[PDB]
Every structure is written in structure tokens, then in C-alpha cells.
Chains A and B, each alone.
Chain A
Amino acid sequence: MATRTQFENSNEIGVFSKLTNTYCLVAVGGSENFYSAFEAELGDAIPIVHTTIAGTRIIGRMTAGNRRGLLVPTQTTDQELQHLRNSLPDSVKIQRVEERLSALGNVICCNDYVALVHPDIDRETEELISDVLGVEVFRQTISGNILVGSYCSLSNQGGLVHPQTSVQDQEELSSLLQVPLVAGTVNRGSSVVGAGMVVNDYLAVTGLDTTAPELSVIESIFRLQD
């Protein structure tokens, strides 16, 4: 089920795409090859939405959300924001976040129940995550790395971390998650696992340079075969 996909001669996937259980966000830049690749995958089941966030092709690092909600930063323009609201149904919640940093896919990683955040986030966004996403919030670093989304990929299946994560840290964090963890490489040695690939409960999409041992790791810990 694991599908290698490339966007504009770049192996990075979570940079330009945002994947939940119930929708997918794609960029508008370059060509429709990357969008048709998800259409081959996702199809008519979940809506796949072309979007920019403050005029960017980069949207998965800009956005952090679950099946129930989607958080966008302050700089999101209301033309884009109204297009997202007309695009996504009532079951998905959208709200701009008035905070210092803008990149959310680096700073908030989550699933439908548990979110790890930046441990030095403001308290208002820490409120808003458990309000909109309806998830449990934990201030945590994955192996002392304060960016928690690019270094740790989550679903309701399981979780994947970068290889510098200690096994003590994996158990320390999976007790909070209640889903298992594996130190994994992606895109041939790139430690950035959250932007190198996206995952939801039935699909994991990664770059072309993600090797077959790495695909076996993802296919095991996120259970891509039924």
C-alpha cells in the first residue's frame, strides 16, 4: 500500500502535502502529476484540496491537524481561508492561530487522540489544540529535538521517529502515545521522517529514494498490509 511519490524532482513529501484520515492538502505548484498520484491513491473517498498558505507551495509544515480539525497560522489570508472553508466540510474545523511561529507541521505532531507539541509553545495554542483537534496535548521533545512533527510521524496505527531517538525515549514517549515507535530512516538516510513521508490510518506516502528496508519498517509499524 506504501506508494513512492515525487514532487517537482524532490523526495520531500510532508513539506508540500498534508495528510489526515479524512482529507489531503496539496500544493498548486508545478504540475498535476503529484495530484494525480494522490488521486490514484485516495480518489473520491476523501477530498484532496489544492491550496496555498500565505502564498506557499509548502503547506504540510505550515498546517497541523487531525480528522476533526485543522490549525492554520496567523498569516493565512482570508481568500485562502475561505477557499479552505468552502473546500472542507463541516466535520473538519479550521481556525487561524495568533502566535509567534507560523510553521505548524514542524511544531505540532498529532493523531486523532494525542498531540505532541513544541515544549516552549505559548499556552493559548496549547489550549487551541485540545479545543479544536479534540486531542491530548503533551509538551515533549523527541530525543531532545524541539521540532516534533518533522522528526516524528504519527497516525492511529503507530508512530515513526528519527534514528537518534533513544529506546528509553521511545518507551517514555510511547507510554504517552499508547502506539508503538520505531527508529526509522526515510529517503535514503534522511532523518526527517515527518516531512519525508506522510501517513494516515490506511496509507503511507513517501519519496522515491525511500528504500525497501525503510518501506518494510513503515509497512510494519504502520501496518500497510492487511
Chain B
Amino acid sequence: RIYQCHFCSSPCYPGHGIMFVRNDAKEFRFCRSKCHKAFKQRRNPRKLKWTKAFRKAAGKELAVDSTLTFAQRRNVPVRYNRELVATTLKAMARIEEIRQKRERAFYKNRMRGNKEKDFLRDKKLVESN
């Protein structure tokens, strides 16, 4: 079972990271001791630029996609269907492709506007003289 890092949002694995449990039984997994010591100092990941609290709070990547509707922890279990398994495998591969495509094309929106503002700003370095 893959969990996220509490401080990175990075996938936590067996053997990887430290868990802290408060008195209210809330488990917090950290992928590394940088995350763990950052939590020890009571720091905000919204302050640290590299972690995904800042990046999903900032708008570098898209954060809501219609591809995200498929990944969710389900508390009611489903009986075993072998025939749904390969369809879910194809779904995971295809949806990860579509997510990377939408993320790259979302970054493709960012780089075009600097051309426009560089045009508008190098007009200011010409038209004054």
C-alpha cells in the first residue's frame, strides 16, 4: 500500500520514511528525514517552495483534472472480478498518459505570454528615444 508523504506528498513505501503518531491517533508518514525534521520544527510546506503544498497552492501545475476522478480510497470493498483487473490496468496507464499530456500542455500556456510581455516591454525601450 502506497501512502503519500505528509510533507512532500511523495509516495511512501515500505522501508521509506518515518511515521509520527500524535495522541489523537493521526499517523503522518514522511518520505525522508528532511520532511521529518521539517515537521519537527513546526514548519509550513506552504513556505517551502519545492514541496507540493506550495506547488499545488501556487499554480505551477494543474491541480484538478477529470482524470483525478478515478484515484480514490474506497472503504466499501468490492468482490473479486478478474475481468475488471486488466481494464483497471489499462485505465491506470492511459490516465497517467493523459495526465502527463494535460500537465505539459498546461505548462505550454505559460511560455507564450512572456513573448507578448517581452514585445510590450521592448516597445518601451524603443519608443522613448
Touch A–B, Cβ below 8 Å: yes
A77-102 to B contact mask, C-beta < 8 Å, 1/0: 11001101110000001111110111
Q: How far is the CB of A128 from chain B (nearest CB, A)?
A: 9
Give B13 Cβ to nearest chain A Cβ, in Å: 15
Q: Is the interface of B mostly helix, strand, loop or mixed?
A: loop
Interface size on B, residues (CB 8 A): 10
Q: Does B84 make an interface contact (CB < 8 A)?
A: no
A85 touches B77 (CB 8 A): yes
B1-58 at interface with A (beta carbon < 8 Å) = 1, 24-26
Closest to A128 in B: B75
Task: Check if A101 sits within 8 Å of B77, measured CB to CB.
Answer: no
Choose among B24, B76, B78, B80 the residue that contacts A93 (Cβ–Cβ < 8 A).
B76
Which of A77, A86, A97 sits near B75, CB closer than 8 Å? A97
Nearest chain-A residue to B24 (Cβ)? A100
Residues from chain B with a CB closer than 8 A to the CB of A98 are 75
Asked if B79 is at the interface (CB within 8 A of a chain A CB), the reply is yes
Which A residues lie within 8 Å of B75 (CB)? Answer: 95-98
Q: Is the CB of A82 within 8 A of B80?
A: yes
Within the assembled complex, what's the spacing in Å between the Cα atoms of A66 and B12? 35
Give the chain B neighbours of A93 by CB distance below 8 A.
76
Whether B77 contacts A84 by the Cβ 8 Å rule is yes
Query: Contact between A78 and B1 (Cβ–Cβ < 8 Å)?
Result: yes
Is A94 touching B1 in the complex (CB atoms < 8 A)? no
Among B75-108, those with CB < 8 Å from A are 75-80
A78 near B24 with CB under 8 A, answer: no
Known: A77-B1, A78-B1. A101 touches B25 (CB 8 A): yes
Report A-chain residues with C-beta under 8 Å of the C-beta of B24: 100
Residues of A within 8 A of B1 (CB): 77-78
Contact of A86 with B79 in the complex, beta carbons under 8 Å:
yes
A81 to chain B: closest residue by CB: B77
Asked if A94 contacts B25 (CB within 8 A), the reply is no
Q: How far is the CA of A93 from the CA of B77 in the complex (A)?
A: 9
7 contacts between A and B (CB under 8 A): A77-B1, A84-B77, A85-B80, A93-B76, A96-B75, A100-B25, A102-B25
Given A84-B77, A94-B76, A94-B77, 8 extra CB contacts under 8 A = A78-B77, A82-B77, A85-B77, A93-B76, A95-B75, A96-B75, A100-B24, A100-B26
